[PDB]
């Protein structure tokens, strides 16, 4: 089970590393993996046309259940995951074997739970609640990959302070007027009562991605920067009583483009 | 399948029972199962040399799964502690290792069939969520939160073992009052100064330590200490009709403050105070002698 | 699995549809499905004698893991589910809602009326009160357990108008039902948690049926019978010299069944009145 998972991770790396060497004139050693969430596939446009980026379809990569994009962004070599529990984070581990990536930048679309948030706002993630992981669906469940990281991983330090300071500094410099908050992302696998529960539980934004990748990247020792696009404000007010009578993506693109040059 | 689970339970029992009958000259009828938590395997040193104890490796008993952790694979130790026949589970299984909850509590079912055990004494290490707790303190468990259980991961899911207990088990009475009073009486008798709080333990799956927001969530939900075991064993023992005494060692203080903000002028490093397994083990080791002596005293009076 | 799940649902519909054709002289097209929860089998007595109702045991219907009763109630053609399935029994959520998906294929049902027993979490509720459900919290759904605006306002108003018309004194609250997996009754700390989470009543069923009915395009009316008041007080401390016994007030299935049966006549009268205006 872990033996087969290890072999598939090594096969994926083996394949990827070979394709890089055949494609690039110099060693390609990406400093970051960028995961483009829903509606944010335009991050790819920010990849320079020279040298010609390398594109591998997931179908072609051993053990990948979409495409991987290898190229330069603002002078830095990166990999983009265009589209996306053990198997869902397999790509992170396969890419870790390249031995160059030290930052995961992950973007997603999320529902606004914090009452201050409005659609179109951004939220830099500085904490998370991994609801399925508290219960029994967890990317690290099973035998530990001892070569990658520890059996018991702290997550109180999951969201790098310097990367967050960097993101905000870059926003003020490109003078982006879009609202950006800092808060807690809750991962779940939506009623008024459930949204109310999420709010009182401490949720600022909610969605069904990101956290398993953040946990897996942290397990590998990477730094993590995570950014949510608030697509809508969830309603928390009770139903009526029977007794009664893509502008965002553009901004995300430029933020990330700026960020990676200092990564 | 339940008829498959019954067969595995009956098989484990038969193996264990036959081992005992061949090892001890008097019928061995343990009154308590003691489950030893992280860093507390020292409890086994309280088993007397005479009569010779019996040690059964998990790897040799049907249905038992071994730890994925080397080389602590886990063993059942049958012997006399302070004159009382007991069985110790030296090592427990955790669901984060990849075992089903049913697998982690199978030994309780198998041992129930000996027909003598009426008390579970369960120990564990836990992170302190209650702000007043400090590493080194003990907490006597008088209540729990089974959040994974509410959400679909429950050791009693499936056809009910009607031979053992009710389809619908109350848990508002899970933590016997007289055993908790016994525990505190022994603290007094032994002049142990270590604090023993009383409070609520929450089971979470792991294997990550909790984020700040998760810990804040557990806190607002009423958690005093958090760990990755114990609750499914308690529930299963209760299903079998045993009384339960549960004792947590607070091995670390969960970090619950919001992380440094990007806007903060003098930020606290987000790594400050982070939990590590090494801190848990070293703190378990420091408190082990007190835990050993408390249990040694308790088993003579059950 | 999925293109085969579809086959089992069609197989169930074929079985049922032919049994109905064989049984009734005129086309029988039920407009409501009533799911009879814990201790509420008495609904069956409200089915009229003429035309004779058809009973189908769950054991003879393809894919069903109880009985289905097809007949007229207060002039309305309905189906009753006498017995429901629960995830704590080891059944997948898909298996627990299979009967709804099969019956949807008749193309005639447009209302689910679902009843259940529930523990009272709201401090003001008493055993014997009813609660009309207007919202829910799906706890297993947080982890992705899933069978595949929910609770019709006009049906809720209809329920209250019938309580008034029938002079039923029994209290009917309106509030939030929390679905938790079971099969244990909640600990004191768990019940206090549910209360702070916004729960008014707690139970181990219903939500997956509601979600499935909505997916099939049906309106939903859900009624909980409060059968017991959940214990919330912290248990006796070892330091208390005058402790309240930890067993005091504990939930039992016996209490649930007895209290379900006591409220059953009122619930039957309500549902009987409602289906005629569905
Ligand atoms: O206090 C409660 N907690 C959770 N569920 C129920 C229920 C509902 N049903 C009743 C049945 C156990 O009596 C089981 O299927 C859950 C009644 N009271 C409670
Ligand atoms: O802060 C905590 N959170 C969750 N569990 C534990 C435990 C119990 N542990 C011990 C072990 C990790 O150190 C693992 O099996 C769960 C001690 N401290 C904490």
Automatic annotation (TrEMBL), chain A:
A Pfam family per the record: PNP_UDP_1
InterPro entries from the UniProt entry: Nucleoside_phosphorylase_d, Nucleoside_phosphorylase_sf, Purine_phosphorylase, Purine_phosphorylase-2_CS
Molecular function in Gene Ontology: purine-nucleoside phosphorylase activity
Reaction(s) catalysed (UniProt annotation): a purine D-ribonucleoside + phosphate = a purine nucleobase + alpha-D-ribose 1-phosphate
Residues given in the record as a purine D-ribonucleoside binding sites: 190, 232
Gene3D superfamilies documented for this protein: Nucleoside phosphorylase domain (3.40.50.1580)
Annotated positions binding phosphate: 38, 109, 209
GO CC annotation: cytoplasm
Enzyme class per UniProt: transferase
GO biological process, one term: nucleoside metabolic process
Record: residues binding guanine: 109, 190, 232
Domain of life, per lineage: Eukaryota
Record domain Nucleoside phosphorylase: where: 34-260
Pathway: Purine metabolism; purine nucleoside salvage
UniProt: hypoxanthine binding residues: 190, 232
Keywords: Glycosyltransferase, Transferase
EC number assigned by the record: 2.4.2.1
Family under the similarity heading: Belongs to the PNP/MTAP phosphorylase family.
Its job: The purine nucleoside phosphorylases catalyze the phosphorolytic breakdown of the N-glycosidic bond in the beta-(deoxy)ribonucleoside molecules, with the formation of the corresponding free purine bases and pentose-1-phosphate. Cleaves guanosine and inosine.
Name of the protein this chain belongs to: Purine nucleoside phosphorylase
Taxon lineage: Eukaryota, Fungi, Dikarya, Ascomycota, Saccharomycotina
């Amino acid at each position: 089970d872990i033996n087969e998972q290890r072999a598939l991770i090594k096969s994926a790396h083996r394949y990827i590393s070979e394709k890089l060497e055949d494609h690039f004139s110099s060693e390609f050693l990406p400093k970051a993996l960028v995961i483009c969430g829903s509606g944010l596939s335009g991050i790819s446009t920010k990849i320079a046309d020279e040298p010609k980026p390398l594109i591998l379809s997931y179908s072609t990569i051993p053990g990948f259940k979409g495409e991987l994009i290898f190229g330069y962004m603002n002078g830095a070599p990166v990999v983009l995951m265009n589209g996306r529990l053990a198997e869902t984070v397999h790509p992170i581990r396969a890419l870790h074997l390249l031995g160059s990536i030290n930052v995961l930048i992950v973007t997603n679309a999320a529902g606004g739970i914090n009452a201050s948030f409005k659609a179109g706002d951004l939220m830099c993630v500085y904490d998370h609640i991994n609801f399925p992981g508290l219960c029994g669906f967890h990317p690290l469940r099973g035998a530990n990959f001892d070569e990658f990281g520890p059996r018991f991983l702290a997550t109180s330090d999951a969201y790098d302070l310097e990367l967050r300071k960097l993101l905000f500094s870059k926003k003020k410099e490109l003078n982006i007027e879009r609202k950006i908050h800092e808060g807690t992302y809750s991962y779940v696998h939506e009623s008024r009562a459930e949204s109310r529960f999420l709010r009182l539980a401490g949720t600022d934004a909610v969605g069904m991605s990101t956290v398993p990748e953040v946990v897996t990247a942290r397990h590998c020792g990477w730094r993590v920067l995570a950014l949510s696009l608030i697509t809508n404000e969830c309603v928390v007010d009770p139903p009526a009583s029977a007794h009664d009578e893509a502008k965002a993506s553009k901004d995300v693109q430029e933020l990330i483009f700026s960020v990676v040059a200092e990564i």
